[PDB]
Amino acid sequence: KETAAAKFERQHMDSSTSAASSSNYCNQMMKSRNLTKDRCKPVNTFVHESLADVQAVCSQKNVACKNGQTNCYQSYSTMSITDCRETGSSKYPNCAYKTTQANKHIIVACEGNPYVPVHFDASV
Numbered sequence: 001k002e003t004a005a006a007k008f009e010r011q012h013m014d015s016s017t018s019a020a021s022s023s024n025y026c027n028q029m030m031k032s033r034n035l036t037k038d039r040c041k042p043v044n045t046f047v048h049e050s051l052a053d054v055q056a057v058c059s060q061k062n063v064a065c066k067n068g069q070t071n072c073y074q075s076y077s078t079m080s081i082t083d084c085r086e087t088g089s090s091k092y093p094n095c096a097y098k099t100t101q102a103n104k105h106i107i108v109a110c111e112g113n114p115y116v117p118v119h120f121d122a123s124v
């Protein structure tokens, strides 16, 4: 099946643009990345940095993960991100999201060889 590293790129990487322009970004992105298939995925973040810059986080600030593992890393720099969060009114199969652009540090869990993000833990 899809590796954890590949799923991360699918769910969280969008190096295309440097930021969210349109208010339908999330609606569009959540559909295309297969995140509205069976249910509406309620919350998701996309990172608008290069894959190299994101993978480099795995050699930055080591921190605990939410689940208590210690293979999580905080980015030294703030990154361009978009937070997608389902509206109060959203109902499958017409999944509806609010798009919010931010610049924040990301925290990711890293694993494997090469040692790359496999989970998006938080932005801060």
Ligand SMILES: Nc1ncnc2c1ncn2[C@@H]1O[C@H](COP(=O)(O)N[C@@H](CCC(=O)O)C(=O)O)[C@@H](O)[C@H]1O
Pocket: 008, 011, 043, 044, 045, 046, 065, 066, 067, 069, 109, 118, 119, 120, 121, 122
């Ligand atoms: N440290 C951990 N290492 C590996 N898996 C973990 C860890 N911790 C939990 N999992 C479980 O494996 C999934 C893979 O991480 P996602 O990037 O897909 N999921 C984000 C939602 C996306 C967002 O927030 O933008 C999240 O739930 O934070 C987690 O949802 C959790 O069920």
